[PDB]
Structures are given as C-alpha cells and as structure tokens.
Amino acid sequence: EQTPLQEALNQLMRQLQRKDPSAFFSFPVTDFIAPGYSMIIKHPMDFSTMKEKIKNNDYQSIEELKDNFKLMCTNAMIYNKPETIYYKAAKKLLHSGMKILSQERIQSLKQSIDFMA
Ligand SMILES: CCOC(=O)Nc1cc(-c2ccc(C)c(NS(C)(=O)=O)c2)nn2c(C)nnc12
Secondary structure (H helix, E strand, C coil): CCCHHHHHHHHHHHHHCCCCCCCCCCCCCCCCCCCCCCHHCCCCCHHHHHHHHCCCCCCCCHHHHHHHHHHHHHHHHCCCCCCHHHHHHHHHHHHHHHHHHHHHHHHHHHHHHHHCC
C-alpha cells in the first residue's frame, strides 16, 4: 500500500503535528478567519495539505516535505505581526520541527529507505 518513503514521511508528520497542540496549522487558513490572507500569502500550506501530498505520492524526498513545513511556518510569520500568538506559535513550531526534520534523521532514513528497495 505505502512505500517506505511515504511511511517515513507520515511518521515525521505525526511528530510535527504533536508540536501544534493548539491546532493552528491543521487545515488551510481561510480569509474568513484571516482577512486578506489569500492576497498576502502566495503559497499557502498546512498539515492536511501535506498529508494529502504524502498520500498522493507528491513528495520524492524528505527535503521537499521539509521545505513545505518551513513554508507553512514562515507564512504565519509574514501574515501575523511578531507580537501575536500565531507568530510566536509559528516561530516555536519552526524551531522544533527543524530538529525533528534534522539532517541526521534524514540521513538515517535515506539509508533504511534505500535498503528497503
Ligand atoms: C486575523 C487574525 O489573524 C488570524 O486569525 N491568523 C491565523 C489564525 C489561525 C487559526 C485560528 C484558529 C483555529 C482553530 C485555527 N485552526 S485551522 C481551522 O485553521 O486549522 C487556525 N491560524 N493561522 C495561521 C496558521 N497563520 N495565521 C493564522
């Protein structure tokens, strides 16, 4: 059903989502919630969109998921001002996920994914 790469991506996604208990990043931000969001943020991203990309096999590396995760956090730091709870939640999530998506974990997974070919 799923490739070893897809399974690794999902395990990383579950660790990243454990760092968003308030659930701000679960689903796309709507303009109803955040007026003008669609005019400000050119490339929206959220965890549910990322989980669909994993399911549809749109990622060919962990690094592409890592780029989408960084994009998701920095979008929140562009739309929301530094003093806001969403900016500070994004900054904390980005820092936590950069260790969850560590280059060391990526290297380890690359080997075990390669050996499962
Ligand atoms: C105009 C005031 O500014 C905002 O309301 N901005 C933002 C708000 C929220 C937010 C709120 C409440 C909830 C329940 C959620 N979760 S959901 C339904 O989207 O999964 C998200 N996320 N957010 C993200 C990311 N980036 N900016 C914002």
